[PDB]
Amino acid sequence: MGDTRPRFLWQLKFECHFFNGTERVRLLERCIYNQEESVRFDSDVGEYRAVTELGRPDAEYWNSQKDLLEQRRAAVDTYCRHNYGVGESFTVQRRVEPKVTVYPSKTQPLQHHNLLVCSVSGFYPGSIEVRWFRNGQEEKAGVVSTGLIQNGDWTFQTLVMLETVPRSGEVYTCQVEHPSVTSPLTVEWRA
Amino acid sequence: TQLKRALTGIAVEQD
Amino acid sequence: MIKEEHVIIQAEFYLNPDQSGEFMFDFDGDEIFHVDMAKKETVWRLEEFGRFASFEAQGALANIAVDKANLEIMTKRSNYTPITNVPPEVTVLTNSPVELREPNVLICFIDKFTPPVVNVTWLRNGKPVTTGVSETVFLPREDHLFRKFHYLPFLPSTEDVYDCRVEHWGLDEPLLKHWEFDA
């Protein structure tokens, strides 16, 4: 755009890191000028610390305020653990079952199918395992994945493909292991 | 229940 | 055994001279909610979240006010050093595997850019799309850059072609990202 006027950005990030549930909690207050962190409060440190020289005054000023220091030290309880307790049910405990489909496909424009695709979409959390079976026997060779894709709408998707030229009569099975189902989902495709 | 925010502090000014 | 690490981030920023402010919560890379400064209200990323928790947007406004002040202070402290434009990488993807006549969403993912000011346009068959599109606020990154999602509902067809046009001060030219359904 023709607005060539200089831009000045100020970011403030409060990170609550939770380890083994609420066993270990760490608060990180980060002040960022443009794309550079200048000062931070680390609960494992207990006081403000300058990241760049630009933030040294603030670190000195804020450390002189004992009310602020005590409140920030207690923030691991009054802020991080509080919000964890409030949001655990729909975040940490969020379980969405994946929609699983199986279809034949091709690696390139070509007159035979050289791929068996298993699409696993719309699930949460991201941890998932996918196995292929030919006639009830697991095929571990020629399996290629697109990796874990985060859609930004609290869902994940992935493709898991089996490089094979399916033959008439064979029955392929995609198996999806995910914390949302007590038994792994199975989808069959009959060639 | 209510989600709490962390309160922002003012930086030191110039002189 | 031990449970996986989870991180909740309260991410807020203020930008001059645009006078833009943002306040949002993030859980493991997903937005929980943000605060719309206009209308002064908490917008949950998933509406269902509003039935389990609440947040007073007024405080976010207060925080943004403080951020504005701090930005100005820092602006003078750095001798009015401006931010360096970082151009984004743009990826077009689909919500799910594409099937003809089966409704879907085209996602334009704008990534790794700063400042958080971008201009995104959808182009169906070359023509700009102005309604029915949706977007997210500017999402935080660990390298303090930004992410953004733009969404376009559509009926897949072999005849239609799509483009995401992204303009940013770090780009030499508007960035076009193409997408088509071919068999």
Author numbering:
A (entry chain B): 0 to 190
B (entry chain C): 1 to 15
C (entry chain A): 0 to 182
What's the paper's own text on this?
CD4+ T cells recognize a broad range of peptide epitopes of severe acute respiratory syndrome coronavirus 2 (SARS-CoV-2), which contribute to immune memory and limit COVID-19 disease. Analyzing six epitopes, some with very low binding affinity, we solve X-ray crystallographic structures of each bound to HLA-DR1.
S761–775Omicron (BA.1) contains a single mutation positioned at the archetypal P1 anchor position for HLA-DR1. The structure of HLA-DR1-S761–775Omicron (BA.1) was solved at 2.5 Å resolution in space group C 2 2 21 with three copies in the asymmetric unit allowing comparison to HLA-DR1-S761–775Wuhan HU-1 at similar resolutions. Surprisingly, HLA-DR1-S761–775Omicron (BA.1) exhibited two distinct peptide conformations within the three copies in the asymmetric unit whereby two copies (copies 1 and 3) exhibited a distinct peptide binding register compared with copy 2. The HLA-DR1 P1 binding pocket was able to accommodate the P1-Asn (S761–775Wuhan HU-1), P1-Leu, or P1-Lys (S761–775Omicron (BA.1)) within its deep hydrophobic pocket volume. While the +1 frameshifted register of the peptide was present in 2/3 of the copies within the asymmetric unit of the crystal structure, the relative distribution between the two registers in solution is unclear.
